[model samples]
Target: QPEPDMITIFIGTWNMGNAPPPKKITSWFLSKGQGKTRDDSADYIPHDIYVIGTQEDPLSEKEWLEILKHSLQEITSVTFKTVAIHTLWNIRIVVLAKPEHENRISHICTDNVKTGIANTLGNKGAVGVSFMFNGTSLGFVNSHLTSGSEKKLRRNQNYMNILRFLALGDKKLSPFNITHRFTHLFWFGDLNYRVDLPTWEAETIIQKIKQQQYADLLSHDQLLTERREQKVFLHFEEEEITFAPTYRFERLTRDKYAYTKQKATGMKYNLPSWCDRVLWKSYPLVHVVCQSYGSTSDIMTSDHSPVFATFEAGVTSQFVSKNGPGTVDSQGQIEFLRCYATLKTKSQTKFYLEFHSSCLESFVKSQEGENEEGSEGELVVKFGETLPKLKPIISDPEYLLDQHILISIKSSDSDESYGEGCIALRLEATETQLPIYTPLTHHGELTGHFQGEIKLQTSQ
Candidate 1:
């Protein structure tokens, strides 16, 4: 029951090296979990949120963005809408979520930290977006650090600067430090940290990569060393690398690494390294589990292979709207205390509340509470909280904030409909136990009110 509140997220990072995107890149978005299922009937997992971060992207951001949107649309059964998109020069971070969740997402803001030329350019910096989804706050950072293998110290400095300078939120409210503000945070991109091995030894390790001997190479990875020493990426946690290095590939070649090339003075080589990555940190309120992390080699237009990480992030609770096929495992209850009516009619009426899951009926004696002396008619009809407890129907897109209740009033004897009203539901993390009131609207007019409370008792 607690697991259904969790949602899957696909976070991807790449260093495009200013190259044009390929015609087909759908493989880059596919999680490694999908590749292991040999049977077509196996359940397919679809991500709720997609965060794409890239550094050294194409000069025309419009074309790159258009291609990405089109590919994502073609990849899943449900449609996705871009929640936030920001670019700091060539660096970009785009956040997309299901359209059904647009109402639950709020407080979106973006900020960037520039550490490029003269510490004033966007060529080497971080761009981030922060937002609230179903009461949980999340932040996504796309950064490009210093490139040279010898500049490892500068790379650390770049990370520290980004953590220190990046600010997001409303100007009316206080700005949030990127690391401290969100319930969960994802920092990813071309980090540019290299392997500690010599070129000869690294090249030997690359040759043995086909045999799946990755432990030797990873033992000398600079990023791993820094993290082990607590010099950089202080609290961030990256998934264990299973694929080969993602950098220094020969453009347009599937298996060729940039082992040798012509330098200014003589023949030089770029050692294959894991320059692109995705790392995350979270607070205690939400738990995040990384399911898959690997590099995609199908698209070879860039020198760096795009790496992706899939996570199942947990939320406190969510609204369930679909009850069918017996797939949902949990049942929650909604209870109403009483109904307030201000009807125009003076005849005896039968009042009933209609919902997709359950219904409540009541008898309202209108003659006793008719508007007297030209006063607004307001009468409380005690419905009592004895209605049947029904389960909420929930499935994919679990995080929801809206539920509809229809109120219908009709003459008791003639069965003639007198008036119709409706109520909507909204709740917060701390407001769940408190009673909430909503105006019951009848034919586009406020006719009465409904008081209700919610209780979440999960059942198997």
Candidate 2:
């Protein structure tokens, strides 16, 4: 359960079979009852965030954007804007946030992994969007895995493929795994994991579904079976299936399942399985409670019903502030020195500086006009503040000369290695500033430059 203060999110996924966008999809965002005899206590609330992932989508990006914005505006009072959207061929991921939360959201980034033919094409794979929302990082991935009941292992491998390739961050230097990079991540798509039972057995279960007996079929669900075996989606959580399966529906029809006849077995109908799904994982101390998880058959343009879930997610930042430690305690033996540098890059739109794995204070300094070509930026690094250690016993000049700072520069967008070099603190004891230059190299080839002065400022 979520308190009123918690932020709410609406997550939905659908495979449109490369069809055009419907005129309206308001039902896709609304909270719907799972089935008969549903409790009416949980009312539908306007979401603070919206994530819609689509596969085999034929509509243009502009069209999808307009439809989503109009759909949200039609239903909610809050004005919404597209925070980020990424598309990989037909697979797409879009994130929307309320206007009031614009300032609190930052570091919005998007990335995609191609797991189609030969693992290079765009026929399949995932597109992801990540951002820092009010100090808690959240990630959303729209994935389209390998289809077919017999290709379960391939689908699992596709999951691993996206896990290893999709990178997100202001500098894209963070870990590739969304589970580790974001405080909470929602993965939703047409996963294509099928019912493990035979066609006849699954049909029997489908009959049971008419009675709302989903637990029996869930026992033989390939996704759940793989999850139980710890082969995929490890540590992810899904809401209980109170509703029927959302996949394998008859196109443009409500409450009807798609069927195929097998010539060999004389079977008139193949099993209808739950293929489209939404799953999530969160880090410790972050609270996420699913308020609703159901599919809407109202919009039935695709063979798959649109699945949606509402979640109340939040974290108690007062437990540990964003700038942890250091603010209250300063009695340690470590001595801190501020290092300033004027750095220019020729390879990227902009670059960020890092020393001892800690990002430096960034301030842009353009050489001419507002263009980024040959743009120089001022970087500030507080030595021993990020990496704490006791003051060295050697003489100031000797110690400074001996200490070398390994500075790494990365492109602000892709995190590709702009350059890396070592700057030796060469100032003498009496000198306040020492001129410095280090040739940066990528794969041992000289490419960029790093120059600055180490200013001796503080003394114990």
Candidate 3:
């Protein structure tokens, strides 16, 4: 059996206490590793695992990396054969891998040309690392944006600049012949922007990424429901379970020793929303299987819980080909057609009917215009042929009835009044032969609209 091609990413925000004790730091690493171990199991051994963070303490970046390395060696027998750490401003990012994958890793901070004015905020506003496995190139970026409200607008602008860099910045280094060719890309960090509903800034940004195709791992629609319930969307299958909150607030009721002056406000510690998230470019080889937002009670090292995902990257080509035929079932096909039809109608009101007609024509052509064995003699009433394209109209009864019945009844009422006061009981019926007209209008308007005076010349 061949091994799967996949990579697992472990993301968390750790607030290493001001001068964290050696034991606590060691325990934190052990706990985090255990989380990874429990999630990864055996297959996790060969994959590249990356853990990212914001507001990590121990002030000295070097010391923190050394502590993390030692802690990992102590808890797990596997050593981080290759490790790279980079820091810009207050944020720290580290990447680790085994020896076989060492040469594939490339790390760098965003330069001014790519970021323009937005690059002014952080000492290193952007950090990116690239690697290749089995000939597939991938890039991962870790960043933390400015947190103050007044500065947030500028920060978001800078973040957009960073995205532009990721998409197009590498071309600038082409003179040296070093190009970033990535079929898969991931951007994970403490963005500080609430990605849930009502506020759609984050969602909009993901949508606007043009150079690379992407999807939000934690979508607004999915997260909004969880947010309303005040819960974390975790568990492999069930995402609504409540978990321990990630942030906390602690305050001194009394004035602390003079170095920090003034009576302190009462502390409030709560994880109101999820500020950290993972996003990725679409790829055939990648499959994200499970993800979790950690609990503070379970792991006390960080003010925020770690978010983790387990994925199986490379499935055999044979397996994919085997399952590809049934990827879209009949119902799914109908639903997709219905959605497309609705979108066309919404976007181009006058052109929708014609659009539906064109789609029906195309579908008929594909089926060679022959009725399927059992469907012959069935009334093939084509709908919405007056629009620009031949799109299949939805056969939803509620939708059909709402549009058809209302229009039919109104047309009938006008015709009834025109006739000699008799009710227009037999107004225009649809091919479905459903009674769709009203008597009032038909009788009022359609009476004696035409008559023949030469009828007497005919002999029987």
TM-score of each: 0.65, 0.67, 0.45
Query: What Cα-based lDDT does every candidate model obtain?
Result: 0.65, 0.65, 0.34
lDDT string, candidate 3, 1-460, tens digits:
3433555554444543243533544323322332233333542243355555544445576676666566556656556754555565556667666555555444333322123344453343556655444334445566655432234355445455564454322342221111112435555565444323232242343343222222342353333444344332111022232332222222221111111112441221121234444545423223445344432333344434444333334321111222123332111111111111111011111111110111121221111111112233221112221212212233322222111100111012122111111111111322222221112112112211111011000001
Per-candidate Cα RMSD to the true structure, in Å, reads 18.0, 14.1, 20.2
- Rank by lDDT, descending? 2, 1, 3
Residue 32 in model 2: lDDT? 61
- The reply for model 1, stretches above 4 Å from the true place, is 1-4, 32-45, 116-122, 169-176, 264-268, 317-460
Q: How large an RMSD does model 2 have?
A: 14.1
- Per-residue alpha-carbon lDDT of candidate 1 for residues 1-460, written as tens digits (9 for 90 to 100): 1323667788989888788878998777775321111122312445788899999887465686677778877766556788888888889998888777777788898888888566436378989998877646678999999876777888888888887678774332221235444557899999988877776665586786767677888897899998888678765688888887888888888577775646731465567788988899775335688877888868788888888888888654333345532444354444444334445554444544333321112222222122222265444444455444444444222332333333444444554434443343334532245565544433223345555554433331
The number of the candidate with the highest TM-score is: 2
Global CA lDDT of candidate 3, please? 0.34
